[PDB]
């Protein structure tokens, strides 16, 4: 029993982390076997951070303008390219803890965990949804760049996200591990802003599920409703529309509880018309959108608390 | 910016997880040099486990019915002995990822992270308090047990909590690393329960001290109190009596922040007794008690490991 925000283990992603330096700028860079990926905005000097031009930029630096460091090791540097956003530095030694990896691009509304890092040594690791505006919620300071997001599966790494930047609100911006960008951002000190957000439905009704499998209830009512019914009320409250295939994606949920999909949208519903009343659900005075159903159906028991 | 509850990262935990198995019954074992610790209830059979006599049981184990996996890897079990409420299996191989360790005895209100864990392969990590009446508030299927709770201070590892068992409430409970309960719980199947619990005052303080140094100040007022008329306010509202060493455990911040303690008591009463009008604190809209001062400078300083 207990439902908490958890993360997966990080041991497979510290053993894969460095320093990267190029001037006076540092950040970090993950080394899989020979080489190391990071932000390219390393290269960036004091005011290239307006109007840098990467091309140019990176033209004019060696090999050896590169400082790669494990710990306070260097590895030397003998070659390198740009792919999109990210730099490749191949380097003179492979990494013998380099997991099992791969490298995915995530969907908005999908969840993963964040190692953050500052200079190459581990701070911290925190589990996050991206959002569906394709920012982050993090917690990030000067020089976590080149942190990444991650999700294991048996002792594979799927990493999903680097850190690149802040905007004006608060919130985190980056790229996947070909060095796109997540939403319409680009890496230069601009007016750039977080679009319009949504709440993630899907995930709202896979935790209401996760309260029902640990046997709480209150919430439920006698009412079932069409998708259509559904989101002409949810989405007066900030929604993401829901579709067929999300309520799809609740089936395994909806079979181990009981409960038809409709039916919890039919819950949320009234949960969005009435509020709480001052009742918790998990513990929470809120709905919660950072589970996806499959962190539901990894965290919770397979055997429902009748 | 941003806030999260953070773990620690891992790593440096996962290396020491082993499975243990007594004849049906498996659980986690932490294995540090050539030591396995593990709840001694694994040595109890698929139903005898009311009330069994420990010392009795362990009389008729052998070294060779104890199976210790790490990994694919056969440990050889050449000793074992019952301390409190574990046990100390000696083993033919020191472990290898054994860190820099400590055995700590935590105390009410302080935090850590857990290291969830089955059939001795990590599952995910999560940050918790050890709360007023003794329990944590985790999340813990069967099979879990033996999974550790963990601070790191540096290059060090403090090992603070074993996983035991749950309570009727969902709650959890468990030992320090010599095997003593948390509480006045015991590992057999009795009656027994949690008692009510209280918010964790100490850590309200020193999480509004992190919202006024990341910007967010609004509740700040230019009054102060005694620390009885606080007591007697915080005392209706389920909050643990804040005492004079609370108070000097909060002198950094209060340094830091320039704000004494009992004008940021007088903040936390007028939210106490007004709510927030809809506003948010660090992104939340209730008050966080799962931070402690120590918590608090960790994440605003960006303090790594090594």
Not at 21 to 33: A, E, F, K, S, V
Not at 95 to 110: D, M
Not at 243 to 267: N, W
Not at 289 to 298: A, G, H, I, K
């Given at each position: 029993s207990g439902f908490r925000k958890m993360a997966f283990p990080s041991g497979k992603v510290e053993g894969c982390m460095v320093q990267v330096?190029?001037?006076?700028?540092?950040?970090?860079?993950?080394?899989?076997?020979?080489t190391v990926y990071c932000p390219r905005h390393v290269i960036c000097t004091a005011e290239d951070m307006l109007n840098p031009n990467y091309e140019d930029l990176l033209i004019r630096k060696s090999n050896h303008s590169f400082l790669v460091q494990a710990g306070n090791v260097q590895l030397r540097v003998i070659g390198?390219?740009?792919?999109?956003?990210?730099?490749?530095?191949?380097?003179?030694?492979?990494?013998?803890?380099?997991?099992?990896?791969?490298?995915?691009?995530?969907?908005?509304?999908?969840?993963?965990?964040?190692?953050?890092?500052?200079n190459g040594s581990p701070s911290g690791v925190y589990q996050c949804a991206m959002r569906p505006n394709h920012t982050i919620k993090g917690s990030f300071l000067?020089?976590?760049?080149?942190?990444?997001?991650?999700?294991?599966?048996?002792?594979?790494?799927?990493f999903c996200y680097m850190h690149h930047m802040e905007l004006p609100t608060g919130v985190h911006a980056g790229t996947d591990?070909?060095?796109?960008?997540?939403?319409?951002?680009?890496?230069?000190?601009?007016?750039?802003?977080?679009?319009?957000?949504?709440?993630?439905?899907?995930?709202?009704?896979?935790?209401?599920?996760?309260?029902?499998?640990?046997?709480?209830?209150?919430?439920l009512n006698r009412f079932t409703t069409t998708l259509n019914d559904f989101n002409l009320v949810a989405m007066k409250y900030n929604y993401e529309?829901?579709?067929?295939?999300?309520?799809?994606?609740?089936?395994?949920?909806?079979?181990?509880?009981?409960?038809?999909?409709?039916?919890?949208?039919?819950?949320?519903?009234?949960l969005l018309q009435n509020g709480m009343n001052g009742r918790t659900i998990l513990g929470s005075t809120i709905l919660e959108?950072?589970?996806?159903?499959?962190?539901?159906?990894?965290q919770c028991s397979g055997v429902t608390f009748q």
């Open positions: 330096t190029c001037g006076t700028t540092t950040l970090n860079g993950l080394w899989l076997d020979d390198h390219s740009m792919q999109n956003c990210l730099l490749r530095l191949k380097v003179d030694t492979s990494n013998p803890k380099t997991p099992k990896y791969k490298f995915v691009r995530i969907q908005p509304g999908q969840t993963f965990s964040v190692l953050a890092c500052y000067n020089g976590s760049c080149g942190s990444v997001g991650f999700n294991i599966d048996y002792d594979c790494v799927s591990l070909e060095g796109k960008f997540y939403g319409p951002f680009v890496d230069r000190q601009t007016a750039q802003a977080a679009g319009t957000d949504t709440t993630i439905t899907l995930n709202v009704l896979a935790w209401l599920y996760a309260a029902v499998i640990n046997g709480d209830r209150w919430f529309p829901l579709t067929q295939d999300h309520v799809d994606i609740l089936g395994p949920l909806s079979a181990q509880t009981g409960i038809a999909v409709l039916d919890m949208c039919a819950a949320l519903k009234e959108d950072e589970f996806t159903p499959f962190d539901v159906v990894r």
